Amino acid sequence: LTNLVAEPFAKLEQDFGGSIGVYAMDTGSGATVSYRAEERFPLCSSFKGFLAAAVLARSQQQAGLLDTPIRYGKNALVRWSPISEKYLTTGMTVAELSAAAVQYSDNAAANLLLKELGGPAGLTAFMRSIGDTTFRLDRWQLELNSAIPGDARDTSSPRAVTESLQKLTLGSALAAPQRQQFVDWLKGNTTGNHRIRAAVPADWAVGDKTGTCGGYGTANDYAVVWPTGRAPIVLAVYTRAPNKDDKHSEAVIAAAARLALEGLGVNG
């Protein structure tokens, strides 16, 4: 049930000047679209979605975790912390930091939560605990965004991202309340309007998390999409390119998502 219908991903990545990796699963039938799906691509900020899921998983055993107030100093405010900079003088709760990390890609929030989980190895351990043997986080922000060609640090594959996203948003990896909270945070993301969402009709529900590394044409998005009248679709689109100065493209990500939905026979 893989690639029952061929789609011109090769022409798309060639026009882009790099590599595009796509894995999309129709959770009803199990049919998939797969292109470079087992190659590694840099996670960039897309790790922050799985970080929030790991926090939610811990909150199942720590009843008061999400409401715990976290205070931080100016030293914690790294570039692009649009929410946490507004609460420097007050603090924020773990839940608020998690929402900011998912919905605004807030860097200070993500760093504080990463510290809570035991750093890159702790997030990697959480992903192993749901059966993901591909994901690896190795560095803190923002060194993890280097996107060096051939470097496996801070990477996963489109397939493993999709498989893990399915487990966390639709499967049993989180308890039901935490699952729906993860979904709600993804639905509330503000940074992905020009990526997978741009391929999704306005009358369908969707949640996503973006990543943008800032070198080597490297950017990505993963999403769960609820077309009306049929089972949800989970998909991941990751890009990279050979030269440090190559620019990423949101349009290429949206276009790859359209091809994935077309390949699955989802009328959009």
mmCIF file of all heavy atoms in Angstrom, residues 63-96:
data_model
loop_
_atom_site.group_PDB
_atom_site.id
_atom_site.type_symbol
_atom_site.label_atom_id
_atom_site.label_comp_id
_atom_site.label_asym_id
_atom_site.label_seq_id
_atom_site.Cartn_x
_atom_site.Cartn_y
_atom_site.Cartn_z
ATOM 1 N N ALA A 63 1.294 14.941 38.998
ATOM 2 C CA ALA A 63 -0.019 15.558 38.837
ATOM 3 C C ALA A 63 0.050 17.079 38.769
ATOM 4 O O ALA A 63 -0.748 17.712 38.067
ATOM 5 C CB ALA A 63 -0.920 15.130 39.996
ATOM 6 N N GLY A 64 0.971 17.688 39.501
ATOM 7 C CA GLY A 64 1.072 19.133 39.535
ATOM 8 C C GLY A 64 2.106 19.725 38.602
ATOM 9 O O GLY A 64 2.408 20.919 38.717
ATOM 10 N N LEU A 65 2.657 18.936 37.676
ATOM 11 C CA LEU A 65 3.783 19.413 36.883
ATOM 12 C C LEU A 65 3.380 20.577 35.992
ATOM 13 O O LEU A 65 4.057 21.610 35.960
ATOM 14 C CB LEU A 65 4.346 18.261 36.046
ATOM 15 C CG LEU A 65 5.458 18.623 35.064
ATOM 16 C CD1 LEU A 65 6.658 19.172 35.823
ATOM 17 C CD2 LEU A 65 5.869 17.433 34.210
ATOM 18 N N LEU A 66 2.277 20.433 35.262
ATOM 19 C CA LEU A 66 1.927 21.435 34.257
ATOM 20 C C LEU A 66 1.678 22.805 34.858
ATOM 21 O O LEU A 66 1.927 23.814 34.193
ATOM 22 C CB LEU A 66 0.711 20.993 33.449
ATOM 23 C CG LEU A 66 0.935 19.766 32.563
ATOM 24 C CD1 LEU A 66 -0.328 19.534 31.738
ATOM 25 C CD2 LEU A 66 2.104 19.919 31.638
ATOM 26 N N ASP A 67 1.167 22.863 36.092
ATOM 27 C CA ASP A 67 0.882 24.126 36.756
ATOM 28 C C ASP A 67 2.056 24.668 37.555
ATOM 29 O O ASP A 67 1.909 25.702 38.217
ATOM 30 C CB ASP A 67 -0.312 23.956 37.701
ATOM 31 C CG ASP A 67 -1.626 23.864 36.963
ATOM 32 O OD1 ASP A 67 -1.725 24.444 35.860
ATOM 33 O OD2 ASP A 67 -2.560 23.222 37.488
ATOM 34 N N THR A 68 3.204 24.009 37.507
ATOM 35 C CA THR A 68 4.340 24.450 38.297
ATOM 36 C C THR A 68 4.884 25.753 37.730
ATOM 37 O O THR A 68 5.196 25.820 36.537
ATOM 38 C CB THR A 68 5.428 23.385 38.269
ATOM 39 O OG1 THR A 68 4.968 22.211 38.951
ATOM 40 C CG2 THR A 68 6.711 23.882 38.943
ATOM 41 N N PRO A 69 5.027 26.800 38.547
ATOM 42 C CA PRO A 69 5.600 28.059 38.046
ATOM 43 C C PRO A 69 7.116 27.962 37.907
ATOM 44 O O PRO A 69 7.808 27.476 38.806
ATOM 45 C CB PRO A 69 5.180 29.096 39.096
ATOM 46 C CG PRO A 69 4.941 28.318 40.309
ATOM 47 C CD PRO A 69 4.478 26.951 39.907
ATOM 48 N N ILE A 70 7.622 28.426 36.768
ATOM 49 C CA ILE A 70 9.042 28.423 36.459
ATOM 50 C C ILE A 70 9.498 29.863 36.298
ATOM 51 O O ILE A 70 9.014 30.578 35.411
ATOM 52 C CB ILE A 70 9.347 27.652 35.167
ATOM 53 C CG1 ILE A 70 8.784 26.234 35.235
ATOM 54 C CG2 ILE A 70 10.843 27.638 34.917
ATOM 55 C CD1 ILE A 70 9.408 25.385 36.305
ATOM 56 N N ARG A 71 10.454 30.278 37.112
ATOM 57 C CA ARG A 71 11.073 31.586 36.965
ATOM 58 C C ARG A 71 12.427 31.440 36.278
ATOM 59 O O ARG A 71 13.079 30.393 36.364
ATOM 60 C CB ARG A 71 11.238 32.257 38.324
ATOM 61 C CG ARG A 71 9.923 32.337 39.097
ATOM 62 C CD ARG A 71 10.176 32.884 40.479
ATOM 63 N NE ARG A 71 11.043 34.038 40.354
ATOM 64 C CZ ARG A 71 12.059 34.312 41.160
ATOM 65 N NH1 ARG A 71 12.361 33.501 42.175
ATOM 66 N NH2 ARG A 71 12.784 35.393 40.922
ATOM 67 N N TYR A 72 12.841 32.497 35.591
ATOM 68 C CA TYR A 72 14.051 32.458 34.793
ATOM 69 C C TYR A 72 14.629 33.859 34.711
ATOM 70 O O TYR A 72 13.926 34.862 34.878
ATOM 71 C CB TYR A 72 13.802 31.866 33.394
ATOM 72 C CG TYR A 72 12.593 32.420 32.672
ATOM 73 C CD1 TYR A 72 12.697 33.492 31.792
ATOM 74 C CD2 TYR A 72 11.340 31.861 32.864
ATOM 75 C CE1 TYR A 72 11.563 33.996 31.130
ATOM 76 C CE2 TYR A 72 10.205 32.364 32.225
ATOM 77 C CZ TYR A 72 10.321 33.424 31.365
ATOM 78 O OH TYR A 72 9.151 33.876 30.747
ATOM 79 N N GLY A 73 15.933 33.908 34.474
ATOM 80 C CA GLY A 73 16.656 35.153 34.373
ATOM 81 C C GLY A 73 16.810 35.611 32.935
ATOM 82 O O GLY A 73 16.519 34.889 31.981
ATOM 83 N N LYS A 74 17.261 36.857 32.791
ATOM 84 C CA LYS A 74 17.463 37.401 31.455
ATOM 85 C C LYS A 74 18.433 36.539 30.662
ATOM 86 O O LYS A 74 18.292 36.417 29.442
ATOM 87 C CB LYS A 74 17.943 38.847 31.539
ATOM 88 C CG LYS A 74 18.131 39.499 30.183
ATOM 89 C CD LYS A 74 17.967 41.009 30.245
ATOM 90 C CE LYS A 74 18.925 41.635 31.242
ATOM 91 N NZ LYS A 74 18.846 43.126 31.240
ATOM 92 N N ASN A 75 19.393 35.898 31.343
ATOM 93 C CA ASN A 75 20.349 35.032 30.661
ATOM 94 C C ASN A 75 19.669 33.888 29.911
ATOM 95 O O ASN A 75 20.248 33.355 28.959
ATOM 96 C CB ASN A 75 21.430 34.534 31.639
ATOM 97 C CG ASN A 75 20.869 33.725 32.808
ATOM 98 O OD1 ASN A 75 19.738 33.926 33.244
ATOM 99 N ND2 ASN A 75 21.687 32.813 33.335
ATOM 100 N N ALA A 76 18.444 33.522 30.280
ATOM 101 C CA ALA A 76 17.750 32.435 29.604
ATOM 102 C C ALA A 76 17.080 32.872 28.305
ATOM 103 O O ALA A 76 16.729 32.013 27.485
ATOM 104 C CB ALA A 76 16.688 31.837 30.533
ATOM 105 N N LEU A 77 16.902 34.174 28.092
ATOM 106 C CA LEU A 77 16.194 34.674 26.916
ATOM 107 C C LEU A 77 17.135 34.719 25.725
ATOM 108 O O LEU A 77 17.829 35.709 25.490
ATOM 109 C CB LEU A 77 15.649 36.068 27.175
ATOM 110 C CG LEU A 77 14.448 36.214 28.096
ATOM 111 C CD1 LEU A 77 14.089 37.688 28.162
ATOM 112 C CD2 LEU A 77 13.295 35.379 27.605
ATOM 113 N N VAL A 78 17.144 33.646 24.945
ATOM 114 C CA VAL A 78 17.928 33.593 23.718
ATOM 115 C C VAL A 78 17.068 34.115 22.575
ATOM 116 O O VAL A 78 15.861 34.324 22.739
ATOM 117 C CB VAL A 78 18.439 32.168 23.456
ATOM 118 C CG1 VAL A 78 19.578 31.855 24.397
ATOM 119 C CG2 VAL A 78 17.327 31.155 23.640
ATOM 120 N N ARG A 79 17.683 34.345 21.417
ATOM 121 C CA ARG A 79 16.960 34.928 20.296
ATOM 122 C C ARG A 79 15.717 34.103 19.971
ATOM 123 O O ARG A 79 15.691 32.880 20.124
ATOM 124 C CB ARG A 79 17.878 35.059 19.074
ATOM 125 C CG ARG A 79 17.122 35.409 17.805
ATOM 126 C CD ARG A 79 17.867 36.334 16.851
ATOM 127 N NE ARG A 79 17.091 36.482 15.616
ATOM 128 C CZ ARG A 79 15.901 37.079 15.540
ATOM 129 N NH1 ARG A 79 15.338 37.602 16.623
ATOM 130 N NH2 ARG A 79 15.271 37.152 14.376
ATOM 131 N N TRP A 80 14.674 34.805 19.528
ATOM 132 C CA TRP A 80 13.354 34.254 19.229
ATOM 133 C C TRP A 80 12.752 33.526 20.437
ATOM 134 O O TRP A 80 12.575 32.305 20.470
ATOM 135 C CB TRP A 80 13.298 33.380 17.970
ATOM 136 C CG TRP A 80 11.863 33.233 17.533
ATOM 137 C CD1 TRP A 80 11.082 32.111 17.599
ATOM 138 C CD2 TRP A 80 11.025 34.274 17.014
ATOM 139 N NE1 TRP A 80 9.818 32.389 17.130
ATOM 140 C CE2 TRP A 80 9.758 33.710 16.768
ATOM 141 C CE3 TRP A 80 11.228 35.627 16.727
ATOM 142 C CZ2 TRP A 80 8.702 34.451 16.241
ATOM 143 C CZ3 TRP A 80 10.181 36.360 16.206
ATOM 144 C CH2 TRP A 80 8.933 35.772 15.968
ATOM 145 N N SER A 81 12.397 34.338 21.422
ATOM 146 C CA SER A 81 11.640 33.905 22.592
ATOM 147 C C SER A 81 10.460 34.858 22.723
ATOM 148 O O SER A 81 10.360 35.624 23.689
ATOM 149 C CB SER A 81 12.522 33.903 23.837
ATOM 150 O OG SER A 81 13.602 32.986 23.651
ATOM 151 N N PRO A 82 9.546 34.842 21.747
ATOM 152 C CA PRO A 82 8.516 35.891 21.687
ATOM 153 C C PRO A 82 7.519 35.851 22.824
ATOM 154 O O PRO A 82 6.935 36.894 23.143
ATOM 155 C CB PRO A 82 7.836 35.655 20.328
ATOM 156 C CG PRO A 82 8.084 34.210 20.028
ATOM 157 C CD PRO A 82 9.442 33.891 20.625
ATOM 158 N N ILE A 83 7.265 34.692 23.419
ATOM 159 C CA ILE A 83 6.343 34.618 24.548
ATOM 160 C C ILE A 83 7.079 34.799 25.875
ATOM 161 O O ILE A 83 6.709 35.647 26.694
ATOM 162 C CB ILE A 83 5.534 33.302 24.521
ATOM 163 C CG1 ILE A 83 4.810 33.087 23.175
ATOM 164 C CG2 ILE A 83 4.536 33.268 25.667
ATOM 165 C CD1 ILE A 83 3.838 34.181 22.803
ATOM 166 N N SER A 84 8.144 34.020 26.088
ATOM 167 C CA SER A 84 8.814 34.036 27.390
ATOM 168 C C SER A 84 9.431 35.398 27.701
ATOM 169 O O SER A 84 9.568 35.761 28.877
ATOM 170 C CB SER A 84 9.841 32.907 27.448
ATOM 171 O OG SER A 84 10.735 33.002 26.369
ATOM 172 N N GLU A 85 9.789 36.182 26.677
ATOM 173 C CA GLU A 85 10.318 37.523 26.953
ATOM 174 C C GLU A 85 9.276 38.427 27.607
ATOM 175 O O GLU A 85 9.639 39.369 28.321
ATOM 176 C CB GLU A 85 10.862 38.169 25.693
ATOM 177 C CG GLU A 85 9.826 38.541 24.667
ATOM 178 C CD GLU A 85 10.447 39.145 23.418
ATOM 179 O OE1 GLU A 85 11.690 39.076 23.284
ATOM 180 O OE2 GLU A 85 9.693 39.683 22.578
ATOM 181 N N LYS A 86 7.986 38.173 27.356
ATOM 182 C CA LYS A 86 6.914 38.964 27.954
ATOM 183 C C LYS A 86 6.636 38.588 29.406
ATOM 184 O O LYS A 86 5.938 39.336 30.105
ATOM 185 C CB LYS A 86 5.630 38.812 27.129
ATOM 186 C CG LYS A 86 5.800 39.104 25.637
ATOM 187 C CD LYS A 86 6.482 40.446 25.377
ATOM 188 C CE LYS A 86 6.740 40.670 23.883
ATOM 189 N NZ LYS A 86 7.704 41.795 23.647
ATOM 190 N N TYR A 87 7.162 37.456 29.876
ATOM 191 C CA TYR A 87 6.948 36.992 31.241
ATOM 192 C C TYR A 87 8.266 36.877 32.016
ATOM 193 O O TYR A 87 8.310 36.255 33.072
ATOM 194 C CB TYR A 87 6.170 35.675 31.236
ATOM 195 C CG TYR A 87 4.785 35.798 30.612
ATOM 196 C CD1 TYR A 87 4.618 35.723 29.239
ATOM 197 C CD2 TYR A 87 3.661 35.974 31.402
ATOM 198 C CE1 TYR A 87 3.364 35.817 28.660
ATOM 199 C CE2 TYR A 87 2.407 36.078 30.853
ATOM 200 C CZ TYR A 87 2.270 35.989 29.468
ATOM 201 O OH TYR A 87 1.029 36.065 28.883
ATOM 202 N N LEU A 88 9.339 37.501 31.521
ATOM 203 C CA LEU A 88 10.619 37.464 32.222
ATOM 204 C C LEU A 88 10.470 37.862 33.683
ATOM 205 O O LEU A 88 11.060 37.237 34.570
ATOM 206 C CB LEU A 88 11.597 38.417 31.527
ATOM 207 C CG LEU A 88 12.945 38.584 32.196
ATOM 208 C CD1 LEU A 88 13.684 37.262 32.244
ATOM 209 C CD2 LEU A 88 13.803 39.629 31.467
ATOM 210 N N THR A 89 9.695 38.908 33.949
ATOM 211 C CA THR A 89 9.580 39.474 35.281
ATOM 212 C C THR A 89 8.552 38.762 36.137
ATOM 213 O O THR A 89 8.386 39.124 37.308
ATOM 214 C CB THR A 89 9.268 40.965 35.177
ATOM 215 O OG1 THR A 89 8.119 41.144 34.346
ATOM 216 C CG2 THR A 89 10.457 41.702 34.590
ATOM 217 N N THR A 90 7.877 37.738 35.594
ATOM 218 C CA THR A 90 6.821 37.075 36.352
ATOM 219 C C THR A 90 7.038 35.565 36.459
ATOM 220 O O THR A 90 6.547 34.938 37.401
ATOM 221 C CB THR A 90 5.447 37.320 35.720
ATOM 222 O OG1 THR A 90 5.383 36.762 34.393
ATOM 223 C CG2 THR A 90 5.160 38.791 35.605
ATOM 224 N N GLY A 91 7.688 34.957 35.470
ATOM 225 C CA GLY A 91 7.671 33.515 35.319
ATOM 226 C C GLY A 91 6.466 33.039 34.515
ATOM 227 O O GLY A 91 5.529 33.791 34.223
ATOM 228 N N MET A 92 6.496 31.749 34.155
ATOM 229 C CA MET A 92 5.428 31.085 33.408
ATOM 230 C C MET A 92 5.296 29.665 33.943
ATOM 231 O O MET A 92 6.255 29.103 34.478
ATOM 232 C CB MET A 92 5.733 31.009 31.907
ATOM 233 C CG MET A 92 5.994 32.356 31.238
ATOM 234 S SD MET A 92 6.470 32.169 29.502
ATOM 235 C CE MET A 92 5.125 31.192 28.871
ATOM 236 N N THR A 93 4.130 29.053 33.738
ATOM 237 C CA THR A 93 4.005 27.665 34.153
ATOM 238 C C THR A 93 4.620 26.735 33.105
ATOM 239 O O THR A 93 4.853 27.117 31.953
ATOM 240 C CB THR A 93 2.553 27.265 34.342
ATOM 241 O OG1 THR A 93 1.897 27.298 33.067
ATOM 242 C CG2 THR A 93 1.851 28.156 35.362
ATOM 243 N N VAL A 94 4.861 25.490 33.523
ATOM 244 C CA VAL A 94 5.346 24.463 32.599
ATOM 245 C C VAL A 94 4.410 24.326 31.410
ATOM 246 O O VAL A 94 4.859 24.229 30.271
ATOM 247 C CB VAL A 94 5.529 23.126 33.348
ATOM 248 C CG1 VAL A 94 5.742 21.946 32.371
ATOM 249 C CG2 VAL A 94 6.685 23.237 34.331
ATOM 250 N N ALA A 95 3.093 24.319 31.651
ATOM 251 C CA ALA A 95 2.144 24.228 30.547
ATOM 252 C C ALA A 95 2.284 25.419 29.606
ATOM 253 O O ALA A 95 2.219 25.262 28.383
ATOM 254 C CB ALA A 95 0.722 24.098 31.092
ATOM 255 N N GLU A 96 2.423 26.632 30.158
ATOM 256 C CA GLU A 96 2.589 27.813 29.308
ATOM 257 C C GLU A 96 3.886 27.760 28.511
ATOM 258 O O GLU A 96 3.920 28.146 27.340
ATOM 259 C CB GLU A 96 2.573 29.062 30.170
ATOM 260 C CG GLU A 96 1.208 29.440 30.697
ATOM 261 C CD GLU A 96 1.238 30.670 31.570
ATOM 262 O OE1 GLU A 96 2.046 30.747 32.524
ATOM 263 O OE2 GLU A 96 0.443 31.590 31.310
#
